[PDB]
């Protein structure tokens, strides 16, 4: 099966040529941070590491950082400055991953190196929609007969839509026995969703999260995860309303 590295999406014309030949996924607008469809877009207490502590391998803003424990990233004003290891989303400190074509789920994400447990993979970026916007896109994606869905609940009536604009996190497939999870992090007082490994993911293994999918559509998508505890369908047994799936 074909595979491509994350740096292949930074070349629109090469990517478009690869996509006509089925060597890369279809074109999408690559973004580095969420874009709000409508205009509606804190020091920790870590004692600064000395230069010698940094040389010794000591970590800055590690497991005991008050910002990290609350899933808040540090800013440029962190007491540990440049050494701060709690700015992964801002610095784009992504896991080494590849976009691969799967047998029946479309494109997916795989580990290019062994990924330890609790490793930041990528941020789930996209166009942040309100409920009015979410409903207009529900109608359009149903009209176009789209196979793949890219709506992620963020907060209350707000949804991150990675259908047209996003990054390689939009390729992560569902598994009923997942090896990743979402985590909601605050960066500059703004909520963001990232994917994190839930276990030691060996190199070459596909990265997947439990979508916990709220299906509004009439027909359930069969789940091809292949787990022993497979639920059979993305979205389980019951169908929910467009208002409930949208977070209301």
């Amino acid at each position: 099966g074909p595979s491509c590295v994350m740096d292949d999406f930074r070349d629109p014309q090469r990517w478009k040529e690869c996509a006509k030949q089925g060597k890369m996924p279809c074109y999408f607008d690559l973004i580095e941070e969420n874009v709000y469809l409508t205009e509606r877009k804190m020091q920790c207490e870590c004692t600064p590491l000395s230069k010698d502590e940094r040389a010794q391998g000591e970590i800055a803003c590690g497991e005991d950082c008050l910002n990290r424990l609350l899933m808040i990233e540090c800013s440029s004003r962190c007491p540990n400055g440049d050494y701060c290891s709690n700015r992964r989303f801002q610095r784009k400190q992504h896991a080494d991953v590849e976009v691969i074509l799967t047998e029946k789920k479309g494109w997916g994400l795989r580990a290019a190196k062994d990924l330890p447990s609790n490793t930041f993979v990528l941020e789930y970026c996209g166009e942040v929609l309100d409920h009015k916007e979410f409903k207009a896109r529900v109608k359009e994606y149903a009209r176009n007969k789209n196979i793949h869905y890219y709506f992620m609940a963020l907060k209350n009536d707000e949804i991150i839509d990675a259908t047209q604009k996003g990054n390689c996190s939009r390729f992560m497939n569902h598994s009923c026995e997942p090896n990743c999870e979402t985590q909601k992090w605050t960066v500059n007082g703004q909520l963001r969703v990232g994917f994190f490994t839930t276990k030691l993911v060996p190199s070459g293994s596909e990265l997947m999260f439990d979508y916990q999918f709220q299906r509004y559509g009439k027909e359930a998508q069969k789940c091809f995860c292949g787990s022993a505890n497979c639920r059979g369908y993305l979205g389980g047994e019951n169908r929910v309303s467009i208002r409930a799936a949208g977070g209301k």
């Binding site: 994606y141 609940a153 839930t198 709220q214």
Partner: peptide, 15 residues
Amino acid sequence: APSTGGVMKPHRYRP
């Protein structure tokens, strides 16, 4: 009458 579609919901892994 969407025949297909839904929303992914964030949640922490627990089981």
